[PDB]
């Protein structure tokens, strides 16, 4: 089915310590394939998925050089955003920006995005067209004029619709055995009493991949959470009138199940 | 692979 490639950058000022922290992570679908952390021995972009390890030295210099650019940028950004917001150098601030591209089953282009935050709040975003920006407030509106002057959207659109799709495809190909696999949810139910007369049914979806899952009852739904090995766990649960367990059923829709599972008790 | 168009705010 569909596919994503997505990068996330986070930069966090830390007054009286030193150039701020910058974390860069890159995902293909639900699997991390790269990493960069400014505070680390390497000072290189580092692999975190098996398949990506087959790109030669020139790919790792390339990505190292680009990722550093991005940190340096976000440094300048903290501080520019301070100027705009009249805040002093004594407070800790964050700057965040994610971007990436979607593709379908045929692997054609779907959507692109690029989004930027300051201290957890929306700051400026590409529109879905890829040609125009939504600005949140008046400082973001300085940025926008800046990025219009500089034809940033033209650039981002060439990337989002271009390089982005072409590199994802390549990843999808050199890593088919791990990225095109689909691990179907190991399914079961538990039952627990409470002060009467009611019982808790708990519908489990375990070690599935990708993470998109849907758990439905005829009401708690924890958020899908990683198991740590590359697969995902989730559960859903209803409190139901004791003795009436056969009236209820749990439907598990997932990309790895030829047909929707349905659970009894 | 990373991209262009990252510019200072």
């Amino acid at each position, epitope marked *: 089915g569909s596919h994503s490639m997505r990068y996330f950058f986070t930069s966090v000022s830390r007054p009286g310590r030193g150039e701020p922290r910058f974390i860069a992570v890159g995902y293909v679908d639900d699997t991390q394939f790269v990493r960069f952390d400014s505070d680390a021995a390497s000072q290189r972009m580092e692999p975190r998925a098996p398949w990506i390890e087959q790109e030669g030295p020139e790919y790792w210099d390339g990505e190292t050089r680009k990722v550093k650019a991005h940190s340096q940028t976000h440094r300048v950004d903290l501080g520019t955003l301070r100027g705009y917001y009249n805040q002093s150098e004594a407070g800790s601030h964050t700057v965040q920006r994610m971007y990436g591209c979607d593709v379908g089953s045929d692997w054609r282009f779907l959507r692109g995005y690029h989004q930027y935050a300051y201290d957890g709040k929306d700051y400026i975003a590409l529109k879905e067209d890829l040609r125009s920006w939504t600005a949140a407030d008046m400082a973001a509106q300085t940025t926008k004029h800046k990025w219009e002057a*500089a034809h940033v959207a033209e650039q981002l659109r060439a990337y989002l619709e271009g390089t982005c799709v072409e590199w994802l495809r390549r990843y999808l190909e050199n890593g088919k055995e791990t990225l095109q696999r689909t691990d179907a949810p190991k399914t079961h139910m538990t039952h627990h009493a409470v002060s009467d007369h009611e019982a808790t049914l708990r519908c489990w979806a375990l070690s599935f991949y990708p993470a998109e899952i849907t758990l439905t009852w005829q009401t708690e739904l924890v958020e899908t959470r990683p198991a740590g090995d590359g697969t995902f766990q989730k559960w859903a649960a209803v409190v139901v009138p004791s003795g009436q367990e056969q009236r209820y059923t749990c439907h598990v829709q997932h990309e790895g199940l030829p047909k929707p599972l349905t659970l009894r008790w | 692979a990373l991209g*262009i168009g990252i510019l*200072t705010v």
Partner: T-cell receptor
Amino acid sequence: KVTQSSRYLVKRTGEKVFLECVQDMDHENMFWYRQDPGLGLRLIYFSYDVKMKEKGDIPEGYSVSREKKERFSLILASASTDQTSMYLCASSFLGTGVEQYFGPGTRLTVVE
Amino acid sequence: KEVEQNSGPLSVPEGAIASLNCTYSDRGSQSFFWYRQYSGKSPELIMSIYSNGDKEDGRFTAQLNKASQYVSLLIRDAQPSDSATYLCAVSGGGADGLTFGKGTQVVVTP
């Protein structure tokens, strides 16, 4: 846009020469070039932020100074006759795949 | 890893099309620039290109082909004002240096 402090210059060998370059485009990067018939632009020095500097393609004979974001000084420490050339300042925003803009050039000639 | 362009002076009849071309050694590259430089003036940015295909801006047509590491600029009506050196430029990825071509001169003759 971008200004350089001078447009033509005539200097004796051994004279130390100051070329200045001023940008009001909030640009963080600044670059000094030579241009010479047959070679093309050669980068002497650049600067990605204040008080920083890195040698370019040909840094021999030259020193730079970047105390200010809008100002990137090139100094010819002892002028030789092979320093006769067109000198171009350039600047750009920091980032990925950004474009530079040039100053008007300075034409400097060095005689014995 | 240099940038290379065809040799000057290329001679072009007024009304005809001037073909400026450019090849680059680094396949990872992502920004491409055309500079116009008249006699004893500084280079002027006249065209930027980023995606595979054609980009049009008045009488200028640029095309980028990444598969081949190949960049083109066409100047459609070759007018007199159009004689200058056209420079090819690629993003050097390193602290925003550019690698420049050596220049192609164009003489548009009346």
